[PDB]
Paper text:
[name] cleaves viral polyproteins and posttranslational conjugates with poly-ubiquitin and protective [name], composed of two ubiquitin-like (UBL) domains.
In [name], the two UBL domains are connected through a relatively short, likely more rigid peptide linker (DKCDEP in hISG15), and the C-terminal (proximal) UBL binds to S1 site while the N-terminal (distal) UBL binds to S2 site on PLproCoV-2.
Residue numbers in the entry: 3 to 153
Amino acid sequence: WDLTVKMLAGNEFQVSLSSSMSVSELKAQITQKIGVHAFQQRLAVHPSGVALQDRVPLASQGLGPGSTVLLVVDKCDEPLSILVRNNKGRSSTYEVRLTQTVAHLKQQVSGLEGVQDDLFWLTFEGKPLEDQLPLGEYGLKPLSTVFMNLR
């Protein structure tokens, strides 16, 4: 599957989807082309401008081989205030950026809570956060609540 990507603020380039033919794989190929995090990519159908739905298959949104998608990169990486609730249900406020790793947040929580980093993990809406992934890949927002879970 070969697709044209047209960036509003710049270049047009080709990508190939040879695995899942999903939005997730389209975003990953764009990362290889322009070095931008998947969670910062905004995509629409060319030329309608209708936004891509992140869980609907590409085939059902009018897209396949030879289709064109519009791409813009969200320029926003300002700090945002989230909550992390400790083992006793006490929440503390943390300033994070979506380009920081889960490991960055775990360092902040480790210091404020006084719990060595390997004695806990973090969950958002029940899903575990992985140290190496950016906070942005979990859809954290201003006022998101994250849970500290002890071993």
